[PDB]
Design a binder for this molecule. Structure first.
Ligand SMILES: [O-][O-]
Ligand SMILES: [Cu+2]
Ligand SMILES: [Cu+2]
Ligand SMILES: [Cu+2]
Ligand SMILES: [Cu+2]
Lengths: 273, 74
């Protein structure tokens, strides 16, 4: 299983990835990933239980969520893997990512509606069902609510942080995890969600297929951090209320721990790390 | 200590906030999930990656996001 930079996919691989995503949507499976994510967004809080977000388990949680989604894609087409979007490099609305043969482009200015690509509402193939904003069409406003995607220099400063995470293990923390997540500092992962806009800026952000490519690159950055800091590892390592410690299991699966997810190579490799 | 309540018409929509977790926001009578961050900033489920300083700011961000659309309850 090799996760490739989206920019490098062949036309055949783009076609097959799109078709596999649209089949998970058609069969009803896709929308339950949107629902799960929103349930965790809404329940993960800085002063109580927190598992998928604003906590050390942000990274292994999204790694296991993306694996569940990749395995569902592979149950439709075994050749498909999740690509990643290096937003530090492919940073404009002209990136091939946003072309009509892949994810389609930005939304029109009146109502944010995406008008091209396979996920445009007009195709009839991408109803937005799990939602808060009552509109049922995919929306985006690339670069509308924040002017720029992170740069490579910004990513490198976060990558340079040696501690995985620090007490109080939440959105106030210093350390790598919270700087990558983006609640402190120059802001990597949260800013990308804000930059895409539309559903990607909300708790039902997996409604946009770019969600997966965004988190696959966040996931790659955790792998690169590990290569940079082989002396550093997941914390906390035991007895922390409300936070998933290294060897504690994670909801919703209950059968996997951060410890089981630290090494991505047990599940996939990258085109280049 | 929770923020004060508020009630105004913003962009033609009624937004209300009140202490109650901890604090409730409504847009035209429909409750909007909002959350407070450790540093005191707020977000809503329709701007959940974008901290703003107050619950009124989160309610206004939600009205901006919705572009007139009814909110669905959570
Ligand atoms: O975090 O989406
Ligand atoms: Cu998430
Ligand atoms: Cu929330
Ligand atoms: Cu995300
Ligand atoms: Cu070394």
């Amino acid at each position: 299983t090799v996760r490739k930079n989206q920019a490098t996919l062949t036309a055949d691989e783009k076609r097959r990835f799109v078709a596999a995503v649209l089949e998970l949507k058609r069969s009803g499976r896709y929308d339950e990933f949107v629902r799960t994510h929103n349930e965790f967004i809404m329940s993960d809080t800085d002063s109580g239980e927190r598992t998928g977000h604003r906590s050390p388990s942000f990274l292994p949680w999204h790694r296991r969520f993306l694996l569940d989604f990749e395995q569902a894609l592979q149950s439709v087409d075994s050749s498909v893997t999740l690509p990643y979007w290096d937003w530090s490099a492919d940073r404009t609305v002209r990136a091939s990512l946003w072309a009509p043969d892949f994810l389609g482009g930005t939304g029109r200015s009146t109502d944010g509606r995406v008008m091209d690509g396979p996920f445009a509402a007009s195709t009839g193939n991408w109803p937005i069902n799990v939602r808060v904003d009552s509109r049922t069409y995919l929306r985006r406003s690339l670069g509308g609510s924040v002017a720029e995607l992170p740069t490579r220099a910004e990513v490198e400063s976060v990558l340079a942080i040696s501690a995985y995470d620090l007490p109080p293990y939440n959105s106030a923390s210093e350390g790598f995890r919270n700087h990558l997540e983006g609640w402190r500092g120059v802001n990597l992962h949260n800013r990308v969600h804000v930059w895409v806009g539309g559903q990607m800026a909300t708790g039902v952000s997996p409604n946009d297929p770019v969600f997966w490519l965004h988190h696959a690159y966040v996931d790659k950055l955790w792998a690169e951090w590990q290569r940079r800091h082989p002396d550093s590892a997941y914390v906390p390592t035991g007895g922390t209320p409300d936070v998933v410690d290294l060897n504690e299991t994670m909801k919703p699966w209950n059968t996997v721990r951060p410890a089981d997810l630290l090494d991505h190579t047990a599940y996939y490799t990258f085109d280049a790390l | 200590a929770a923020p004060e309540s508020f009630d105004e018409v913003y962009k033609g929509r009624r937004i209300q906030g009140r202490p109650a977790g901890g604090y409730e926001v409504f847009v035209d009578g429909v409750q909007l999930h909002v959350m407070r961050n450790a540093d005191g900033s707020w977000i809503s489920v329709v701007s959940h990656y974008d901290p703003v300083p107050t619950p009124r700011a989160a309610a206004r961000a939600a009205v901006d996001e919705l572009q007139g659309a009814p909110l669905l309850p959570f």
